[PDB]
Amino acid sequence: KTRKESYAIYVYKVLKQVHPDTGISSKAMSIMNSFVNDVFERIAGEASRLAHYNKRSTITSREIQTAVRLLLPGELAKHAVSEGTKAVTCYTSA
Amino acid sequence: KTRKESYAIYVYKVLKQVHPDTGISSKAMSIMNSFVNDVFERIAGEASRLAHYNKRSTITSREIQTAVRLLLPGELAKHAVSEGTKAVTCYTS
Amino acid sequence: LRDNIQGITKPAIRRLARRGGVKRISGLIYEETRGVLKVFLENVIRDAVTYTEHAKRKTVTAMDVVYALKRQGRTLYGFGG
Amino acid sequence: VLRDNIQGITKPAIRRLARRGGVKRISGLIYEETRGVLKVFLENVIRDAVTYTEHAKRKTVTAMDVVYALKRQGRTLYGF
Amino acid sequence: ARTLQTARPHRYRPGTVALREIRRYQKSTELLIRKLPFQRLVREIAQDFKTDLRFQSSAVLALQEASEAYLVALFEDTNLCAIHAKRVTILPKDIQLARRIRGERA
Amino acid sequence: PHRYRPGTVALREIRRYQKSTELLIRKLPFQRLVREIAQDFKTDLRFQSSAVLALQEASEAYLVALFEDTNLCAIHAKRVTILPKDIQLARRIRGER
Amino acid sequence: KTRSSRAGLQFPVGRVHRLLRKGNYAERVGAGAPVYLAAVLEYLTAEILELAGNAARDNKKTRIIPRHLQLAVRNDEELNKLLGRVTIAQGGVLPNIQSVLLP
Amino acid sequence: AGNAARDNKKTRIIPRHLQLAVRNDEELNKLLGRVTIAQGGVLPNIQSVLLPK
Amino acid sequence: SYLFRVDENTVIDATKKGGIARFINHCCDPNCTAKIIKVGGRRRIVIYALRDIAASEELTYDYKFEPCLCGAPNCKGFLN
DNA sequence: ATCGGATGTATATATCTGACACGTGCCTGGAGACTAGGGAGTAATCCCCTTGGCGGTTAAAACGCGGGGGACAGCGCGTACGTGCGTTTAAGCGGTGCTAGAGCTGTCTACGACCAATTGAGCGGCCTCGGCACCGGGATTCTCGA
DNA sequence: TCGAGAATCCCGGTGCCGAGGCCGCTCAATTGGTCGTAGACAGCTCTAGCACCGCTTAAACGCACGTACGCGCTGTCCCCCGCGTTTTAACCGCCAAGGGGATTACTCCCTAGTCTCCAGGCACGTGTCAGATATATACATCCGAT
Ligand SMILES: C[S@@+](CC[C@H](N)C(=O)[O-])C[C@H]1O[C@@H](n2cnc3c(N)ncnc32)[C@H](O)[C@@H]1O
Ligand SMILES: [Zn+2]
């Protein structure tokens, strides 16, 4: 059969490190998957729109940061940008 | 100096058919230009998403037709799809 | 299939209104509500059927309803979104 | 710096705005309420305007930045 | 001193069974409309668009979810309107005002 | 001598203002207000001229519209005046709060 | 022979094809998509300019100003839904007074 | 969601727990102000004009 | 006594080793309760806020022991 | 309702500019022609899952009724809002000056697309048991009439 | 004010099905290397946002009076709720069939892409008449007395 994809195993690997003993249901897993897809589309679409106004031809790690800082509310923005820049630093120096 | 393209002259050519002796001011022409830009972006975005859903890459005259049927209200949809199909017919020959 | 809107009976509307938080229903609400619901359903199924006949098929899927919902501002999580 | 400039939105100005909207008898406590509402709206729009400016490494808030900030909130604006 | 612990006919007046149904429904999470009537209503409404569709069984269900999460929310708003007019009942002139202010009628 | 009945100059002003398209708020104090609200996000801000007006225009079409709703809420309570508990309902129904 | 004239249009099918290509919408723009889209845009701008001119005539003027576009749009019933959220600048409000208020 | 599912004496995150976790927050509520979480129910709330005296 | 009853055949003793949860007094009117969760398959005692609690407020809690320096408006003279 | 007048608004002539409409160069975006290639159209087919029908049962809907709480109408009191007039004040307008910073151009290079070989992550199919739904029987709270 | 009875929560016992781990098997992510170009950057030009000054004059403020509307209270009556009895069809389980949704296999034709050729659209001036005032006057609306 054709193999379709999702974020099931990754949401599970995150659940097994935030609550090392809880376990997610099935409908709740599909809800978290569609949530991840929706936020992905929001952020990437705003990042594109922003990398268009400025006539740049690429969607870099700063269009994404400004998108995250526009869409996400007051305090989620600071923590999101901190986690993002930490990950990007830990990745580039490796 | 600096070249910026707009839909002013086409809006003027259409005005000279719907009312052969009236004249748009500057602010109203700016408003009509922004309106054309807005509607173009709506229809193009909806056609793009509609092609992405069926897993295609060609954005052909069927996607624009379906996007006009989705976006425009009841009556404007009928006349718009009619003008569109008439123009593509009179162009493919 | 004629005159099925009477299938949204009075107790169902009472339960919806209870979950909504209202305490003392009037007596005329049970028709305004069916009108509102019919309008909403038409507005959604129109776009669902458009999405489903653009793809050259005769089966209204769940992705079609999810898209027709997301397009009107009201997204919906849980059905393959 | 500037401070306490919100008081520039006078009583006759709010009065005329209400009259355009259709009002006929304005209460007394309204002026403060609409001043707060207007301040909230302006803050929410100028935040995005300044973000759009910063992203482009500029120091002047263009008109297209205000247009984009307004459009991003579902309030488009024709004429700029 | 001892070891502490955590453990060791009728007619309700009108307006009380309502305040109990509110608490028992605001905590449940099931669907409040019968499924076959909604099936038939969806199928009957989709006649005006295309004759014979097949309505995959997850489509219908999907609609139902939204169709609740709309109405319920609507009622919340209408409630406020009622409470605003210094009354407790919700009247059709409340639903119309909610839908007007909210943008659905204009 | 002569005195218009209390409340009859209201409708005259209503018709006079609903018919024109001018800007109701004075331009310079609004420029000052918008110029000092943005002092919380940056400091060397310049505010190109046609931006401010832009803002101002939008910031009128909001308030006017809001009052168009506030009145309704007032009229809902069998009233004429628009007391400050109407603006709050009119802003909570449309999801602005 | 420009591709707009070949269709019997006034909107630049070439420029619309260019915008569709260079706007990052899909991988391969079709052939009869820009014709359709230019025709739709022309129909809409004609439908709005007609009522704009009508409104500007009844007010005994020959120039269309934003007040007349505001009137033309908001008076219509299906353009008012298309442009449901726009705020035409220098547009003003449609005159209306609640019946309860006037004596 | 896990905090809710634990304070409810269950051990399986379930759509109701996600609805609670979102609508009880204040900033996760603005990020998801338009969505509807299927099978999430609603948040318990009764006005004060309605509660008996 | 700082003893606490987990279940019938197990108790927690915080007289010499434990948390600051041993510094919560019995009051005839409590604003915190004690539930028994099971995490990792084992029972534990958590303290939930019964009613809203403002800052710099003492955390009251009902011991249910089955003299009383209660100090409450309405109150009984026995911890038992 | 009837005037009398007093205020406001609409009508028409005069005139006065500045912004719209038109003609001019000129620069580059659009049109023609041709090729290669992969994306989409078309035929076969298979099996999933939708539709249809049927019997039981029992949960939920429908109906009728009694009455108590709520909606709605009607009045007095009084205050806080509108209208008008005389003050103040700063908005607006014009004119000058100037410097910050937007904007555009050429040079260089660091970075992302593209392509080949591969290999292990994750995806589909198989169990399987522990968490959860269900049932029953206690205690425990809440409402209401006395 | 307290009994009682109806509803609600909590503790055990029990079965069952889906959440989770395991095995093979792909196929897409990884690594390495090339190559064209998107953008960084140093630099210069010029425009337009900022600040100040002087007048005037329209808009804002303070104040007085008076009156219209908010509002709190009282009083009918009516209709929506809570409850009991009868009726219906939703729901569950099950069987049968066949349409059409996916998938596979070929094939061909529609579009990207490049080069060649030039005309259409945009910045730039210049002309004049459409609309904005401005004034004088007529007509409409509104308010007091009767
Ligand atoms: C958890 S300890 C409280 C901590 C105590 N305040 C201390 O200083 O350690 C509970 C014990 O404190 C005393 N206590 C707590 N609350 C009390 C009260 N309301 N009246 C009298 N003794 C009390 C009793 O001895 C009881 O066994
Ligand atoms: Zn005590």
Numbering used by the authors:
A (entry chain H): 31 to 124
B (entry chain D): 31 to 123
C (entry chain B): 22 to 102
D (entry chain F): 21 to 100
E (entry chain A): 1 to 8, 38 to 135
F (entry chain E): 38 to 134
G (entry chain C): 15 to 117
H (entry chain G): 66 to 118
The authors write:
In yeast, H3K4 is methylated by the evolutionarily conserved COMplex of Proteins ASsociated with Set1 (COMPASS), which contains Sgh1 (Cps15), Sdc1 (Cps25), Swd3 (Cps30), Swd2 (Cps35), Spp1 (Cps40), Swd1 (Cps50), Bre2 (Cps60), as well as Set1. The ability of COMPASS activity to be fully stimulated on nucleosomes by H2B ubiquitination depends upon the presence of an additional COMPASS subunit, Spp1, as well as the RxxxRR motif in the N-set region of Set1 which is also referred to as the Arginine Rich Motif (ARM).
We determined the cryo-EM structure of the minimal, H2B-ubiquitin-sensing subcomplex of Saccharomyces cerevisiae COMPASS bound to a Xenopus laevis nucleosome core particle ubiquitinated at histone H2B K120 via a non-hydrolyzable dichloroacetone (DCA) linkage. To drive tight association between COMPASS and the nucleosome, we utilized a variant of histone H3 in which K4 was substituted with the non-native amino acid, norleucine (Nle). Methyltransferase activity assays on an H3 peptide fragment (residues 1–21) confirmed that the COMPASS was active. We therefore prepared complexes between COMPASS and H2B-Ub nucleosomes containing the H3K4Nle mutation in the presence of saturating SAM and determined the structure of the complex to 3.37 Å by single particle cryo-EM. In the reconstruction, two COMPASS complexes are bound to opposite faces of the nucleosome in a pseudo-symmetric 2:1 arrangement. The COMPASS complex spans the entire diameter of the nucleosome and is anchored by contacts between DNA and Bre2/Set1 at one end of the complex and Swd1 and Spp1 at the other. Compared to isolated S. cerevisiae COMPASS, nucleosome-bound COMPASS flexes around the central Set1 catalytic domain and moves Swd3, Spp1 and Swd1 toward the nucleosome by ~36 Å. The Set1 active site is oriented away from the nucleosome and contains density for the SAM cofactor and the bound H3 tail. The 88 Å end-to-end distance between the exit point of cis-H3 and H3 in the Set1 active site is too long to be spanned by the intervening unstructured H3 tail residues given that an even greater distance (~100 Å) would be needed for the H3 residues to wrap around the nucleosomal DNA near the dyad axis. This arrangement therefore indicates that COMPASS methylates the nucleosome in an asymmetric manner by recognizing ubiquitin on one face of the nucleosome and targeting H3K4 on the opposite, trans-H3, face of the nucleosome. In isolated yeast COMPASS, the RxxxRR motif is disordered.
